[PDB]
Amino acid sequence: MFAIIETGGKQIKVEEGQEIFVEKLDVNEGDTFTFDKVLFVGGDSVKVGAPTVEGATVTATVNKQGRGKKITVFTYKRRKNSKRKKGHRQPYTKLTIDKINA
Amino acid sequence: MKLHELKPAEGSRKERNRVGRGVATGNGKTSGRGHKGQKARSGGGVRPG
Amino acid sequence: MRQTFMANESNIERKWYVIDAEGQTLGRLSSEVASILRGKNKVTYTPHVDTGDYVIVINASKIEFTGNKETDKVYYRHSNHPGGIKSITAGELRRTNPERLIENSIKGMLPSTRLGEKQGKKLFVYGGAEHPHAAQQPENYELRG
Amino acid sequence: AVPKRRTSKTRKNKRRTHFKISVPGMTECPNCGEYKLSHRVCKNCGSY
Amino acid sequence: MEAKAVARTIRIAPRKVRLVLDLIRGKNAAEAIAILKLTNKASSPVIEKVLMSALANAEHNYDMNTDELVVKEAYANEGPTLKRFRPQGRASAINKRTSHITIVVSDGKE
Amino acid sequence: PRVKGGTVTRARRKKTIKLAKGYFGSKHTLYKVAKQQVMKSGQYAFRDRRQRKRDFRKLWITRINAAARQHEMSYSRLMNGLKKAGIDINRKMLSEIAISDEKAFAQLVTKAKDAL
RNA sequence: AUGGUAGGAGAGCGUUCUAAGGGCGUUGAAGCAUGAUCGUAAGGACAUGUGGAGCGCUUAGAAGUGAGAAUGCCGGUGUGA
RNA sequence: UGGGAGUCAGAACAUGGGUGAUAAGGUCCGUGUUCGAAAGGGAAACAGCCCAGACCACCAGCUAAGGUCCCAAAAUAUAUG
RNA sequence: CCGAUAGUGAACCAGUACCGUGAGGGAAAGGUGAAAAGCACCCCGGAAGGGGAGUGAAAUAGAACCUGAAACCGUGUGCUUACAAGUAGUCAGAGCCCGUUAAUGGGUGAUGGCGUGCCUUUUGUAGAAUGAACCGGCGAGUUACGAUUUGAUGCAAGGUU
């Protein structure tokens, strides 16, 4: 009903049908990804992970391999003559959960 | 060759160093001279020997 | 900026509590009341909004000091005229306006923001066992050990 | 006599909020003519 | 339906003309004329001539009835200033500032 | 060939002015004061990208403490017993479970208790 | 495995021309000034205004080349009652 | 071996030991910390303790310590005497 | 090549305004034409407007027809915004919007935490150390010509201009 999946280096709480944003995976758009590190399945019946649940996948479908909004890394030092301007765009991937499997 | 596709030999040209044009060149304010004294001054420095 | 819950008004439900100050130390009771007043005991605690409940302290003539704090421990205040320093001891303040005493102790443990000043106004303190807020039906709270 | 800092736009215009004109009187001309100053037979069309 | 008039390079400084221009803004034209008649300020006659010019425009060129009109906008812009050297002090300069006075009048309808 | 400085100065300054939009007073209009502010605001945001992680961890831990004290537990004994149990879920996750699903939170409070 | 006002060898842009090639242009073509794109750059390809006849791209060469302060100078402008 | 330098208030807090008035926020010297360009980050805040050299960013989440009412990561943090 | 802070100080009223007793010093300001066709005509206050009118392929192209830009400054509208102690931003979000040279597009404006310049000069400064609104001519690396160290060759028993 909800689950806690581990992806990227982080943890995410999901329900069926929501869209999530995740660190870049190596898949294509339209494919189907399956997360297998599941730590906690909640809801009606509650399964608690050993570290993980040993069963327990969540499947989702990939929309939009994308690149994030630009941030501008700027730093300087006040009366030295040094500064640095850098641009960043972080890659993400977007998914839509269909099925959590306890 | 063609006059629209001219190309010098490789490693045979180089752009000159332009001093005093801002901080990120590395030769920005004091232009390579350091801070004060005789060698910082225009036409300065001591005669050879 | 993923999923962390933040409360806003239309989430907050504030309650009313009643704390009996009889036989308690001033600072030990005041720390606990300050954290009731801030919301730090609710799982929906969020710092930029006012969570946290209302507290009534009822007895307040029977609050206790330890040691010789009754005749040492003087409260000073200055009036911004020169020479204008004034003072009163803690025991003298306990027998003359004891509610100023407890609300000054509690209000010293709250932050000095505009949210802190707003949260300090959720506190009501009475010398002696009666209080007018029967209409909001407050519960008794026991101080944690 | 001198200001240390220039005053900004917002401080200048905060100083000018009382610096304005009040609305005049107007007891109207009932016999003939333009509306005259209050309690005046004013010099342009006064029929008080 | 809107009539307007401007008066350009009027030799009064704009700060002094915006004061009385703040009185007549958004009022009816008849009571605007009465307010302009009962203020002793140096710029009430100038502004009154611009207002009468705009009401004459509305009656003659657009055939609006001049008893329904309100003063929709009234403002003063800076014109070009003239620089004078004061001989009377010690060689410091004095600018003659000037202004552009615009009035627009309307019946509130479309 | 003389090159005169035309049009490039104005492009370079005008985009710093456009970066300063929404700033008070003459910081959104004038190049030098708007430039110094845009420098300082890049520096601030660099610092605050790192302070944001500390702030949100602190907030999660405060919520967990409040949730744990309604079962007669500290935060610290709870996190210890959760470690000895082997449970490896975040503080972001723990705080969201305590807000949303109170029953599940009670469930893993019991696993933290008997592992001690 | 990969900081440095002093350091070396780096890839790049605004002006000009060759020395070219190839374009946008008097059913409009600008440039320039107001627009969502490119960007660490410097620097250029499609909605208002402009006009109403001038510019880009590519490769290479040449620099009245190279724009926050100097109690800087001023065509200078304009503020601070 | 050759090209190109900066630096010579080069210092300032730190002894190690010492001189001299045992202040000197004065003289030597042996390591340290910054360093200036290494900015920073937890020694109130401080190119004068814990930590850093740099791919470099980034919602990795988990560590180094100097750590753990209110502030404000982080033991109300206890238990024992 | 000067392309007009220009070979010129001056491509306009220039060695003139002006300044100085005199020797002397010494500016600013340049810019149709498509054709004045320069608002007959006509209507309300002197100036200035509002209308029509026009040679007007286009007068917010009206004597500032070299057009003509910006910024400083303005000023009149509005959308959101009013218990306080302030390197004014930054990181954590109710109301109002709505999309090009197009897709976590485009936003706009309210909150709790944290908070020191081109700069210069310093062992050390952010001033109670220095110097400072906007724009720009417009403002800081040739050769006579040498020396010495880092591409291609007549082309290597070899060197000529």
Side-chain angles (χ1 to χ4, degrees), chain A residues 1-43 45-53 55-102, chain B, chain C, chain D residues 1-30 33 35-41 46, chain E residues 1-66 69-110, chain F:
Chain A
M1 176 160 124
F2 71 88
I4 290 166
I5 60 178
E6 167 167 343
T7 182
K10 8 205 170 315
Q11 289 177 15
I12 296 179
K13 164 156 178 292
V14 290
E15 296 179 355
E16 339 222 19
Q18 65 164 304
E19 295 166 353
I20 59 167
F21 298 87
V22 140
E23 213 75 54
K24 175 178 66 68
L25 279 5
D26 33 334
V27 271
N28 292 334
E29 307 195 350
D31 284 3
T32 298
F33 186 85
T34 152
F35 308 95
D36 27 303
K37 257 97 58 182
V38 179
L39 308 188
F40 183 89
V41 177
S45 188
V46 169
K47 297 191 194 46
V48 186
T52 79
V53 174
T57 60
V58 174
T59 62
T61 142
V62 177
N63 353 99
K64 189 50 158 310
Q65 292 264 207
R67 221 139 118 263
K69 212 208 293 197
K70 192 164 192 143
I71 83 172
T72 294
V73 192
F74 179 87
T75 52
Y76 73 108
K77 277 149 247 218
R78 38 217 291 204
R79 81 267 182 238
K80 276 71 249 210
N81 290 257
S82 54
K83 67 204 168 56
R84 175 190 66 153
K85 187 169 175 181
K86 205 119 213 142
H88 195 62
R89 282 187 104 187
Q90 186 74 9
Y92 67 97
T93 168
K94 175 167 153 160
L95 295 106
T96 317
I97 270 82
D98 29 78
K99 193 66 170 68
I100 101 110
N101 309 282
Chain B
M1 265 201 301
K2 299 299 201 177
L3 257 19
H4 40 277
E5 299 165 329
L6 265 2
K7 200 87 55 159
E10 193 172 12
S12 105
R13 290 294 159 123
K14 264 189 65 79
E15 67 177 354
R16 71 194 294 175
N17 189 60
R18 278 235 228 103
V19 122
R21 293 297 188 275
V23 153
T25 40
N27 290 85
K29 187 227 314 193
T30 71
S31 272
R33 277 187 199 259
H35 268 129
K36 272 157 161 192
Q38 216 165 333
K39 314 219 270 164
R41 311 290 175 185
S42 153
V46 113
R47 74 149 190 272
Chain C
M1 275 107 260
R2 309 269 317 143
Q3 34 222 7
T4 294
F5 178 80
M6 307 271 175
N8 47 56
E9 294 277 327
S10 77
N11 270 332
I12 331 251
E13 313 295 327
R14 314 213 161 97
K15 307 225 300 159
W16 284 77
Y17 288 109
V18 167
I19 294 180
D20 190 14
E22 186 171 25
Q24 314 278 147
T25 331
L26 181 70
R28 307 235 167 217
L29 161 120
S30 304
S31 300
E32 301 222 12
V33 174
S35 68
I36 300 306
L37 252 17
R38 251 163 74 79
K40 291 278 252 46
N41 61 320
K42 298 181 176 322
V43 71
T44 47
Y45 169 75
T46 131
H48 57 94
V49 88
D50 182 22
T51 336
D53 308 288
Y54 296 91
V55 182
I56 292 134
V57 183
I58 43 165
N59 264 285
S61 302
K62 315 172 145 50
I63 189 95
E64 302 179 345
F65 311 118
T66 31
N68 296 293
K69 282 177 212 166
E70 203 193 352
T71 58
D72 310 351
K73 174 55 161 209
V74 10
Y75 295 97
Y76 300 95
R77 60 187 199 279
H78 199 274
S79 88
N80 318 314
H81 285 69
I85 176 86
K86 283 173 192 50
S87 112
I88 171 152
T89 57
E92 182 75 28
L93 222 223
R94 189 181 42 189
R95 44 152 284 256
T96 298
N97 204 359
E99 296 104 331
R100 166 106 90 243
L101 174 80
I102 283 191
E103 80 201 11
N104 280 350
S105 185
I106 283 168
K107 275 203 227 291
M109 333 200 165
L110 290 185
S112 262
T113 42
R114 37 255 264 199
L115 182 72
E117 284 170 319
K118 215 173 190 319
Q119 291 183 322
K121 294 158 159 65
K122 288 200 304 237
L123 158 75
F124 302 89
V125 31
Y126 299 102
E130 300 299 319
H131 63 92
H133 318 289
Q136 8 277 159
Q137 310 175 280
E139 299 170 37
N140 300 337
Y141 191 91
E142 284 91 31
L143 286 199
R144 254 42 127 193
Chain D
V2 313
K4 179 30 208 148
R5 316 268 332 122
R6 41 126 79 163
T7 144
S8 43
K9 290 165 188 229
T10 147
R11 197 177 291 252
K12 198 180 67 188
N13 290 325
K14 280 182 192 181
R15 199 180 58 249
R16 303 183 179 161
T17 148
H18 294 292
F19 183 68
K20 69 177 166 171
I21 282 176
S22 45
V23 206
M26 200 199 321
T27 48
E28 280 82 349
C29 239
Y35 287 159
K36 91 225 83 170
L37 210 46
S38 193
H39 304 40
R40 264 72 179 177
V41 257
Chain E
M1 202 30 95
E2 281 179 355
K4 76 150 170 181
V6 337
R8 277 194 173 106
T9 319
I10 280 306
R11 307 251 181 82
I12 300 165
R15 279 190 70 196
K16 302 168 158 149
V17 82
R18 291 170 179 149
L19 245 38
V20 348
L21 226 46
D22 291 326
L23 294 174
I24 58 163
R25 184 142 53 233
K27 303 200 175 321
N28 312 89
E31 72 161 314
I33 293 158
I35 294 161
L36 291 175
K37 274 173 193 317
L38 309 177
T39 61
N40 58 331
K41 286 303 249 175
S43 76
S44 315
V46 184
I47 293 172
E48 188 190 35
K49 248 165 187 197
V50 191
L51 179 64
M52 297 312 290
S53 175
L55 301 170
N57 286 351
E59 183 194 350
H60 185 77
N61 287 155
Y62 314 103
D63 273 280
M64 292 195 261
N65 161 58
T66 54
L69 304 172
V70 301
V71 184
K72 197 202 189 150
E73 297 162 0
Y75 53 85
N77 277 337
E78 308 177 334
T81 104
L82 323 164
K83 319 289 211 321
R84 298 290 100 101
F85 283 131
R86 167 154 293 167
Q88 305 113 12
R90 313 211 56 192
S92 40
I94 287 283
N95 32 60
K96 297 294 164 62
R97 305 163 169 272
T98 200
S99 57
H100 300 332
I101 302 166
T102 300
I103 276 168
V104 19
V105 96
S106 84
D107 42 14
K109 87 210 308 177
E110 255 289 338
Chain F
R2 185 175 180 241
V3 355
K4 62 211 296 292
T7 75
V8 314
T9 315
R10 201 198 336 269
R12 178 183 44 85
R13 302 196 177 124
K14 195 172 158 296
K15 68 181 59 189
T16 300
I17 296 298
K18 192 247 193 72
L19 242 43
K21 145 174 172 290
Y23 289 0
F24 171 84
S26 72
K27 329 253 218 189
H28 67 260
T29 48
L30 315 183
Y31 175 63
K32 290 153 157 187
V33 58
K35 178 188 172 176
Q36 295 162 207
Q37 191 65 79
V38 158
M39 279 160 53
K40 176 81 81 218
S41 57
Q43 180 68 248
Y44 279 152
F46 180 85
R47 165 200 80 187
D48 290 339
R49 284 196 293 277
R50 327 224 145 157
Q51 302 189 305
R52 163 164 80 206
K53 303 171 175 68
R54 315 174 197 167
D55 287 355
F56 269 93
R57 176 161 169 140
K58 158 174 69 214
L59 171 70
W60 301 321
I61 292 186
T62 312
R63 299 187 163 172
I64 290 155
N65 221 350
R69 276 167 200 283
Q70 299 166 355
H71 302 273
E72 279 67 38
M73 255 201 156
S74 297
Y75 165 88
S76 65
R77 296 194 71 255
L78 168 73
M79 295 306 298
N80 174 40
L82 235 32
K83 228 274 310 292
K84 271 163 179 176
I87 316 297
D88 276 351
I89 98 165
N90 265 1
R91 295 158 178 83
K92 179 173 173 177
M93 300 293 121
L94 227 43
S95 109
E96 287 306 316
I97 294 174
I99 289 178
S100 271
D101 204 329
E102 228 205 6
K103 207 170 295 309
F105 191 81
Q107 196 112 2
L108 40 86
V109 165
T110 56
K111 318 202 93 98
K113 270 180 175 148
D114 50 11
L116 287 184

